[PDB]
Coordinates of N, CA, C and O in Angstrom, one line a residue:
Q1 N 0.8 -1.2 0.0 CA 0.0 0.0 0.0 C 0.9 1.3 0.0 O 2.1 1.2 0.3
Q2 N 0.2 2.4 -0.4 CA 0.9 3.7 -0.4 C 1.5 4.0 0.9 O 1.2 3.4 1.9
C3 N 2.3 5.1 0.9 CA 2.9 5.6 2.2 C 1.9 6.4 3.0 O 0.7 6.3 2.8
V4 N 2.5 7.2 3.9 CA 1.7 8.1 4.7 C 2.5 9.4 5.1 O 3.6 9.3 5.6
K5 N 1.9 10.5 4.8 CA 2.5 11.8 5.1 C 2.5 12.1 6.6 O 1.5 11.8 7.3
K6 N 3.5 12.7 7.1 CA 3.6 13.1 8.5 C 2.4 14.0 8.9 O 2.1 14.9 8.1
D7 N 1.9 13.7 10.0 CA 0.7 14.5 10.5 C -0.6 13.8 10.2 O -1.6 14.2 10.7
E8 N -0.5 12.9 9.2 CA -1.7 12.1 8.8 C -1.9 10.9 9.7 O -0.9 10.3 10.2
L9 N -3.2 10.6 9.9 CA -3.5 9.4 10.8 C -3.0 8.1 10.2 O -2.3 8.1 9.1
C10 N -3.3 7.0 10.8 CA -2.9 5.7 10.4 C -3.4 4.6 11.4 O -4.1 4.9 12.3
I11 N -3.0 3.4 11.2 CA -3.4 2.3 12.0 C -2.3 1.3 12.2 O -1.7 0.7 11.3
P12 N -1.9 1.1 13.5 CA -0.9 0.1 13.9 C -1.2 -1.3 13.5 O -2.2 -1.8 14.0
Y13 N -0.4 -1.9 12.7 CA -0.7 -3.3 12.3 C -1.6 -3.3 11.0 O -2.2 -4.3 10.7
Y14 N -1.6 -2.2 10.3 CA -2.4 -2.1 9.1 C -1.6 -1.4 8.0 O -1.1 -2.1 7.0
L15 N -1.6 -0.1 8.1 CA -0.9 0.7 7.1 C 0.5 1.2 7.6 O 0.8 1.1 8.8
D16 N 1.3 1.7 6.7 CA 2.6 2.2 7.0 C 2.9 3.6 6.5 O 2.2 4.0 5.5
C17 N 3.8 4.4 7.1 CA 4.1 5.7 6.6 C 5.2 5.7 5.6 O 5.8 4.7 5.4
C18 N 5.3 6.8 4.9 CA 6.4 6.9 3.8 C 7.8 6.7 4.4 O 8.2 5.6 4.5
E19 N 8.4 7.8 4.9 CA 9.7 7.7 5.4 C 10.3 9.0 5.6 O 10.1 10.0 4.8
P20 N 11.1 9.2 6.7 CA 11.4 8.1 7.7 C 10.4 8.0 8.7 O 10.6 7.4 9.8
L21 N 9.2 8.6 8.5 CA 8.1 8.5 9.4 C 7.7 7.1 9.7 O 8.2 6.1 9.1
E22 N 6.9 6.9 10.7 CA 6.4 5.6 11.2 C 4.9 5.6 11.4 O 4.4 6.2 12.4
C23 N 4.2 4.8 10.6 CA 2.7 4.7 10.7 C 2.4 4.0 12.0 O 2.1 2.8 12.1
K24 N 2.3 4.8 13.1 CA 2.0 4.3 14.4 C 1.3 5.3 15.3 O 0.8 6.4 14.8
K25 N 1.2 5.1 16.6 CA 0.6 6.0 17.5 C 1.4 7.3 17.7 O 2.6 7.2 18.0
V26 N 0.8 8.4 17.5 CA 1.5 9.7 17.6 C 1.4 10.2 19.1 O 2.2 11.0 19.5
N27 N 0.4 9.7 19.8 CA 0.2 10.1 21.2 C -0.2 8.9 22.0 O 0.6 7.9 22.1
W28 N -1.4 8.9 22.6 CA -1.9 7.9 23.4 C -3.3 7.4 22.9 O -3.7 6.3 23.3
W29 N -3.9 8.2 22.1 CA -5.2 7.9 21.5 C -5.2 8.2 20.0 O -5.9 7.5 19.2
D30 N -4.5 9.2 19.5 CA -4.4 9.5 18.1 C -3.3 8.8 17.4 O -2.1 8.9 17.8
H31 N -3.6 8.1 16.4 CA -2.6 7.3 15.6 C -2.3 8.0 14.3 O -3.3 8.2 13.5
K32 N -1.1 8.4 14.0 CA -0.7 9.0 12.7 C 0.7 8.6 12.3 O 1.1 7.5 12.6
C33 N 1.3 9.5 11.6 CA 2.7 9.2 11.1 C 3.7 10.0 12.0 O 3.6 11.2 12.2
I34 N 4.7 9.2 12.4 CA 5.8 9.8 13.2 C 7.2 9.6 12.6 O 7.3 9.7 11.4
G35 N 8.1 9.2 13.4 CA 9.5 8.9 12.9 C 10.5 8.6 14.0 O 11.0 9.5 14.7

């Protein structure tokens, strides 16, 4: 699947972010793209 831009949501164990971001939890409830 496509990547994910930083600041954009996402789902752990489903989609992944572009790079070097990481499609995971950005906080404790909101899941987006990090690094």
